[model samples]
Target: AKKILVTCACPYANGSIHLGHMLEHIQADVWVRYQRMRGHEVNFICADDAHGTPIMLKAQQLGITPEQMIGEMSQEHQTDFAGFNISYDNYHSTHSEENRQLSELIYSRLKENGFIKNRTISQLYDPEKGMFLPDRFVKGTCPKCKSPDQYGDNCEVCGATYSPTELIEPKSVVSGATPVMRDSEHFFFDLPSFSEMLQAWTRSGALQEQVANKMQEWFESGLQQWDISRDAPYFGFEIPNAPGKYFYVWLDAPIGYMGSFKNLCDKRGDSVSFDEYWKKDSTAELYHFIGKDCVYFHSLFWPAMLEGSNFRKPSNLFVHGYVTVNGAKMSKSRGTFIKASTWLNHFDADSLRYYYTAKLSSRIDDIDLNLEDFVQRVNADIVNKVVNLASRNAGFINKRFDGVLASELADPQLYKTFTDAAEVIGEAWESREFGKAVREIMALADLANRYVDEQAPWVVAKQEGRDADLQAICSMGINLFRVLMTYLKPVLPKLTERAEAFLNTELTWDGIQQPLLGHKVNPFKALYNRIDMRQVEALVEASK
Candidate 1:
């Protein structure tokens, strides 16, 4: 079996996960599960991005160390994902010894290749705190637009970019004290040196077309020497040789993928080499799933680092759009900016999983999960259509028949329809066209409903001596449910388990392509209930 390595962009540990975070996690989890069901050897890795200034500030606010803060957040994140049925082989944190070692190794490789250089740059420093402030730790009026509330990186009002030192009247966010300009020596990564190789690989279809285009445009415009080091006091791994300096969060964020893999290998007592999976050409397919906002780091600097360090190039970078509620960015005032805990409180995680799978496509399109749409889509599609087909038909059959599988259909038209629907759904899933895959699967459900109405299973049951007809209809319904379960297992593992209980058999992709008959069907139950508008409204209110 071909081995595939999958990774989701690590969530920054500075805050709680929102719907936007769940969207990416679910997308990657669904794909990874699908590949597993298809009998491929795969490893899914992710971690809490536990570095940077926000974490340090947040930890200080809570009167805890940065490591303690990350530890708490990481545990909460893992539990939340489990509640949502998001599975991962390993969930490591960037603040691990494994990551420290890997970071040093990679940094050393880049330094040896002359891709790393040191420079003294002036930055805002707070004398009261007796420390240099990282960009995120400082705030001031935008030098370009004079926006009163602006971060150190860019001006939101004018969209003008400047360094932290450029901000006028800069103040430390932590101490609210005025900061003075001071010079510090920090390491920078030479991104321009690898521009040619990056541009060539990017244009060769190693990344999504839009991403490739954006990267090409950026590279052509000009590349910047990326500052990869931050002066202490910081919350990340310090540069090995350069004391009082830490690797910038972005510098080590992508490296967490390797750190996670190492953690997993260590736990298994296996000395798996990173080069085997990352450096070897034929052994791995590396797919990165991230939101569009993080594209520059993942597409440009990440690739440059890998190339400079002689790691295998990424197979593809999958970028998805941001999640919006009610056609606008999620807002706290409107209750749309929901936390993971809030979402888990009201509905099953499977509902969101199914919703995202139904909305996601291979392209980088943003998915809007409006409150009304969420209710209508899940209730009408999953409850009324998908799960209801099994509930209504299965109960009718279980009441009369001995739960036997129906014989193979002799009707060429019916068999052809089944085969065609299954083939289309499977192919769509394989190609990562999840939205189309769900549409095709739902079409199959519609066909099953139509088959029930046309065949009049109820009418056949009422007629005397129509036992075979009843059995046949029940068998068909069971087979349809089996097909649905096989495709849905990736989105909802719990649903698949329930489906196993119903069919008394293991659900597999191959079995979905065929029919089941003459088997003892289990008792029927409602797989999902319709979502009431009021319930959705309450959820919306609670999220506020």
Candidate 2:
């Protein structure tokens, strides 16, 4: 009924995808799927952040070209994304002709608007490697915490930001050599010029309440010009007429959203024009799902660039917090950094999706993956409640009643309740209150379980001339099960697909409102199994 554009932050294509990377994707995918089920014209897009200093160095270490490196990594990321049911209409990369064209066009507009400036800035340079290094390339003791081997940007232990020069005994990661200062000519975006425009957007319901409050602090401090160009030896698009210099990763990264959507436009019908969504004055909505680490960059610089490029700013932004393991940072040496592939090796993607859906909220609060909680929640809800609705009823329908649904909903009020619940739950989903929606669904699930137990269909099966009564009761059970599956289709896609096939009907919100009558269902099968923690243990062992 409405047109919307959705994007998750691009994943860096330099290594295996860890659980940390899955948070934004899973969050966005659930929302996108819900909107699609509501009959909206929704386009969900994402891409690999393929161009950066880290990619260049990682490629060098692997003895492969940067292009080859990104190509391989994109494939890996797509596989993991699919394995988790991230229903993206288009998934592309920043290294494309579409992106190159858009980046150049945006830069040209900024230049014409007199928003481009050139200045010489001093940066840490590695003489041994004969190259300039960004903050991530150097490591030393944190000036605040005195923690050894901290990155040039901030201290991991104390969460303090500092200039590279402030670090004690800094050395280059490229060569393990001390770094020296050198002046480099760089290009900057005139962010200060857009201060008034940004303030208006910030307070104009474009940002969440908490996010807008944080942005006010930056507004008080004032916006400064942002560096958009980097020196050579970087793997990214080249700035026009600027030889031996390239656009910085931050400059091109956000534009990847447009590039990815443009790529999708090329494959779709001619009626679906790219300009309809991105052009200024267009009414179509645009939203971004990003982590809290990027609030400053995304809510500030990204929108400013869009304005300067003659494009519409994002209509909304959903900023979430990082993922923690057992209330601690996800670790690699301690085997807490569970890769996507590693998780897949043990459990289905639906389990993680369900867990995330149940725990995720609309706020920017960190989510913890307590392994024990994850295991119990999946089993106690999915195995014991949702799927149990079908397993306990489907077997009776197939073996005793020939899998034919009854001609009537024996209890009309219960069916009405299930369907009516969708209204509030759908509203919750519309507002991105995912945790609230899940709680409501679980409440319905608890009701369904209680009804089934009270009906005692299994007891009816044993009595004489009670087969008809048994069929009617279990038929209503199947109908209730179908409704729950429809509600869960977005969060637990794999489980719902199986449920849909087993029920012999399409799962949709529309179908949830209608009670099934005089229809047939497929034979009963094990819809899902309780999660065995031994698999989780094995995954942790493999990680170690």
Candidate 3:
């Protein structure tokens, strides 16, 4: 079995967990679970991104210490992830002591390697808040269209990109006070120095086609020095020997992956794993699942930092696009901007997980959660198609055969048909073509249902002296259900658990070859039930 480390992008602690965040986490979790099923040793890691000027200011407004605020958020974040069965081996915080030590270590090493540079740069400062304003904190008329209330370096209204200094009559969004230009000493990572290295990695076919193309666009624009230090009064680890300066949030954010892994190793008393997985020349495979918005950081700055610090870089980066509701971005007023916690109140986790997996592919295309389609799709596939196998055949096993399946081969050829497709389905999951896997599994589901329809067990139950025939037909159907649920174990966890209890066997990839013959199966009330539009409407209203 191969040793692998997988990570989802850290969720920011300043806000509640939303569907947008869950999409990435669910995608990563599906892959992680699949790897484990195939007998690979996988460590799934994630953490709360708990530092930044925003976190510091948010804590101030809340009348609490930054530590306390992040601590509370950490608990809430972990709870939400667990509710969705995210299966994170270690969920830590960027604000932890582990992160602090690693951040300092990496920054010090980079400096020693001559990749760090110090310079003075002017920034907009808010007098009332007594802090240097980040680009997003400054708002003014867009320089291109003169549109008012535009924030950040880009104007959303007119799609014009410019520096914050280019805004006309710029004011601080925090204090709404006129800002002044203030010069501060800052440290920068010499990203340009590693351009050739990053370019080689980008073109090595390790990234998605779209992602590699995006990197080419960045290369054409030219690489520049990336600011790595933020002034004091920030909520992050301080730069070593540089009092009044702190490591920028972005610099330590990706390193949190390592910090979180170290935290896991320390907690487990695993001294060798930390070095085994991270040290240069290590054989462990590393993958990062991130959104398109964070591509520049993970694709360029992150790998360079690891290389410069004498650590093993990531093996590949998986990029996905944003989540939209009803073909548009989530709308709060329309009640579509749903939170992860809020979703549980209306629907089960498996419904959403199955929907996302059905639409997901091995590309960077955006997935839309159309509520109308979601309700119909889940009801038809889960309730009508997959679960129908168990529901249709279980009655005969429980009532006539005393929960015992028939002994002997009943349509062994059909059972072999299901087992033979395992190789291709396994390949789809391995390659991250989730949509293709779902489609293949559902096609098999259709064939299984058709087999039952041809047998017509309902008619067999009514005939005289047909007990043996009835037993064989139903047993074959139940065995088919067993194989199907085994294939779906990674996508639907709870349903898989129920299937195991009923089938009297654990669903393993290799175990499907030996069918459950003469097995006593347990009865279940319902494997799955249908969902309707009313529930979807209720969820939307609740989100708003």
Candidate 4:
């Protein structure tokens, strides 16, 4: 057994949880559950990125304090994640005292270590609003395409990327005023100083191939000092001894991962400790699950921060691609932009979980949620392939045989075949080849279904004096169902609980060697039910 800490990138508190966010959380949750099932000590952590200029400005527009806004959004985020059955051990916020202390501490350590730099840089300031504008907060005609109303950093019309300073006739979207270049003394992390160390780690084969390739591109472009401070009128923690300056949201956001874990350590007492896991010499493994868009920050700056602060750096980063709907980016106009909460109204959590698991692999590739295919796949795989094993066999055990499984194996060789696949399946899961694992498990389900068909239990039940044969056949099917569900427990949480109730035993990886026999299996109306296209159409319409 090993001690491991896992985290999903902190979700920004500015919006509700969407399917894109769900994809990362579900992916991490599945991995975490598997680790625990394998007897590892795992701490799954996440938090709301509750501090930023956007959060501050939005709160001001709403006539509320930043605290109130963050509080409300944190609750909503937790609710949505919970609705999807994300198994986070600690869900905290960047605005908490833990983050405030840790951010200041890390910054102080970096400063003491000579990795922090300060420089005066000019930024687009909204004079009317009395605040600096983020690149996205400014809009103007594109310099390259001469397109009107393009964002400050990029042109959607021409796909040209440039500095906000280069935008023609730039105006602040917040104040609707012509913005002016204003200078502020901002702090920067000397990212260029860590270039060699980052490059070494990037080439260590810990990251996905595409991720390493992207990092090489970043390295070629050259690493520059990264701005780590925001000016006054910001919602983040204030810099130590710098009254008018605050830590940039990007800087403190990753520290929130530590803050959240430390918070959990404090709350749980002896269950865990913060320093034991985060100390430089600690052996615990740390992994961050993040989107492809966030690779640069997590891979480069985050580790630099940890190293400079004398804390343990991440062991690895599990990067995944964005979630698209119906072979394209999710679009509100197309009604494919679905929220996490909206999904639960139309289908069970396992439907989306199984679908995503079926497509997810170790590599970072965008997974599409084809709603039409989603309906067909879930109905066929869950209702027909997996749950059908239990539903078809349970009636015989409950009604004809007093809910008692046969005292001995119906076919010992067949049961061994199911258990024998465990090693390869476990390895697939451990290595994060989720799609491969799903394929292997589903193949076993097909074999289990085939065994029931070969026995023809329905035909044997009508024959006189074949009572003993019928019990053994149906019991074999139920036992096979137990093994399949054990393999699937990590991917399907709600359905796993129901399986546990009916089987009268907890499903474990090692427990599959001994099949359920002479056990009084309880009856269930349905382990899982089928979903339809009408529900998908309804969900899309509701999203619109």
Candidate 5:
């Protein structure tokens, strides 16, 4: 078994966990569960990015301390994630002693390595709110495309990027004040110093080819100084020896990975040391799952910080795209910006989990959530294809045969046909090609359903002296259903549970080799119900 440490990007602690956020969590959790089922030693970690202006402002609006605000949001986030059955070893918060220590330690290392510099910088300031505005806090017309209400860092409408000053008629999102240019002494990381190192790492196959090609353009343009300090009134860790200055949320946010792992180490009672994963050339594999919008931080700034701080760089960066509803991006007026809590009230976790893995692949292409398609996909794949196989044959094995499977291989050839897919399916899962894996399983399901129909087990049961034939046929169907569920254990965990109880066996990769012959199964029960359109309609209406 390989040793792996995986993390999803920290979500901001200012809003509810939406479907967009669920996309990354579900994708990462699926891979983690797959690894665990394969008997690998894997640690999946995540945390809330509890710093920044939004968190601070939200706390102020609620008349509570920022710490209290983050605490509440963290609880809600954990609840939502747990509701979705996210298999995180530890879900933590960035605002903690662990992050404080690592941020200072990494900052000091960069200082000693001459990779830090101090300079006077100008940023957009909100006079009415009495604070400096981060790039995301300022909005104006895009510098390139003249798109109104574009964010300062980049334009969602035009895909143009520029500094906040470049925006025309810039205004603060906080107080709607006309932001003014104000100068402050700030600490800047010498990002240009790591250009050579970054160029080699970017081409080292850690990123997708498309992402690498995009990085090439930035390489040609060159890296710029990254401001690492935020002025007073910021609600985050205070910089060492720099009163009235706080570590920018971005700087501390990524380091939360190490901090979170360290915290987990403590909780795990020293069974695993933190150094093995953080050492400069440790053997343990490291990975970061991030979104396409935030690629720059993980690929560039994050690696640079780790290398400079005498730690191992990431083994791979799995990037994914946004969550679009139907054929369009989520719009508030259309109620497509569905939250995780809202989804849970209307649908089962396995439904969304199966639906997502059916569409997810290794590529970073955005996946749309067509509501109508979701109902059909789950009902057809899980209900009709997989679950129906068991539903059809269970009664035969239970009612007439005293809940016992006949001890015989009625169709060894058909059984071999299903077991033969293990290697190919395993390959697809190992490479994070879930969509490909699900497709292969669906094909097998199609064949199994066809096999049951071809045998006409229903008609065989009515014929006299066909008792033995019917019993053997039902055994084959039940065993085949067990085979399919074993392979799908990672994606359909809840189904695995039901199958386990029904089959009187634990779900595992090894179980697929040992079919239940002459083994008595528990009484039959409905595994799941088909999703109705009314549920989808109710979910959409509730979201609105």
Candidate 6:
């Protein structure tokens, strides 16, 4: 089995977990879970990017220290993620000691290579606050589009990019007072020097085609030198040798993955070493899942930094589009920006998991949660089709004969159907075409339904002296149910557990390919009940 390391974009600890956050988490979780079920050794890791201007500002507003605020938010994030059945092996923080050490090591290497330079740049400073204002702490009109409510870095209205000093009528977001320009020496990473290396690496097929194209386009336009350090009064890892200077949050965010690995190694006292996974090319396959907004960071700067530092480059950069609600960007006023915990209170976790897998694509196309579509599609595909087959057939078998595995298939078409479904779904998953994988599995459910209708097992059970035939029918039903569960394991793990108990066997990919015979089955229970239209409507209303 191959060893794999999977990571998702770390959510900032400034707010509660939202559906947009869950969308990315579930995608990575499903992929990791499938690999494990296929018998691969995989490690899934993630953390809270608990540093930056947003967290600091929010903490100050709440009259609490940054540590206290992050601790509270982290616990809430973990609890909500667990509630959704996200099985992350390690969920750590970017502010840990291990992460600090890794960050400093990377920074020191960049400095030694002449990529780091000290530059005196003018920044917005609030005299009354007695500190230089971070970009997030300042707001003003956009110089390009004349938008009155633009942030310091870029304009959301016109998508114009500019430095904080370029904003007209800049005012401190904290004090609402006019800010003065002050010069300070800050460390900047010379990203332009590595432009050619980044371009070649991305074009070398190390990244997805769409992602590589996007990164090349950005580089062709022009690469900007990145400020890798922030001044004091920021919540971040302190620079090792420079007092009152902290590494920018972006510089340390990806390094958190290594920090988490160190945590795992220390916990188990493993001698395998993180260097094998990160610094050596032959031992590890790294995959990063991120949203489109952060594509430039991961595709360009991240690869350049890794290659420059002699760390292994990522094998694939999986970029996905934003989450929308009802065909539009989620808006609080529309109530479509639902919290993760809020959604959990209203619906079953598996329902949402199956819904997203059915619609997600491997490309950068955005997915939407249309309330009408979500209710109809989930109920039609999972409840009525997939779950109903197991529920109805299992009930008939329990009433007619003692629960036992079915005999081997004598019909050529039936055997071919089972083999074909498993192979097709497995291939789709391997390609990371999750939507196709789900559809292939659902097609199996359709075939099983047709088989049941043609056999008319209930009709056979009605006649007396068909006792032997009744047992045969029961066997067929139970066997088909087991197949469905095995196929659905990646998308719905809890449902797989239910199937394992009912089938009385350990479910595995190898075990799934072959038919079971003469093994007793467990008692029947409804896998899923029909969702009430009113409940669906209420959920829609509450989301709004």
The CA lDDT of each predicted structure is 0.83, 0.89, 0.93, 0.92, 0.90, 0.82
Cα lDDT tens digits for candidate 2, 285-322: 99999998889998889989999888998888998888
Q: Which stretches of candidate 4 lie over 4 Å from their true place?
A: 142-148, 155-162, 166-169
Model 5 misplacement above 4 A: 126-129, 135-180
| All-Cα superposition RMSD per candidate | 2.2, 2.3, 1.6, 1.5, 2.8, 2.4
Candidate 1 structure quality by residue, lDDT tens digits, 1-544: 7688899999888778889999999999988988898899889999999998778878888898888888999998888888888889999998899899889999999999999988988877899988887788889999987888787789989999998778888888878899998998888999999888777887687577888888878977999999999988888898987888899987888999999998998898877545568774656788898999989988889988988887886788888999998889999998889888888888889889988899999888889887788888898888877777678678765777766666665243764676667677877887779999998888877887787778888788889999888777767766776777777888888777887888888988777555775667778556777877788788789987
What is the alpha-carbon lDDT of model 6 when measured against the actual structure?
0.82
Q: Of the candidates numbered 4 and 6, which has the greater TM-score value?
A: 4
Sort all candidates by lDDT, best to worst: 3, 4, 5, 2, 1, 6
Q: What tens-digit string does per-residue lDDT give for candidate 6 at 1-544?
A: 8888899988888889998998899999888888998888788899998998778878889999999999999999999999888988889999899899989888988888888889998878998876788787789999998998787799999999998888999999888889998988899888888887787787687677888788768977899988988888889989988999999987999898889878887787886767778874657788888999988988878877876677887788887788898899988777788888888878878888888888887888998888788888888988877776667667665666566545555344674677667777887777779899888777777877777777777787789888677566656656676777777788887777787887778778778666777667788566665665576666657877
Model 3 CA lDDT for position 92: 95
Write out the backbone clash pairs for model 2. Answer: none
Model number with the top lDDT: 3
Clashing residue pair totals per candidate (backbone < 3 A): 3, 0, 0, 0, 0, 1
lDDT (tens digit, per residue) of candidate 5 on 60-162: 8899999998999899999999999899998888998999999999999999999889999887899999999988889999989998999769999879888
Please report how far candidate 4 places residue 286 from its true position, in Å.
Answer: 0.3
- Per-residue error for 462 in candidate 3, Å, reads 0.7
Off by over 4 Å in 6: 139-170, 407-412
* Residue 380 shift from truth in candidate 6, angstroms: 1.5
Q: Considering summed lDDT, which 10 consecutive residues are worst modelled in model 2?
A: 266-275
Error of 2 at 188 (Å): 0.6
Candidate 3 ranges beyond 4 A from true positions: 140-162, 166-169
Error of 3 at 198 (Å): 1.4
Worst 10 residues of 4 by lDDT: 267-276
Superposition TM-score, candidate 5 onto the true structure: 0.94
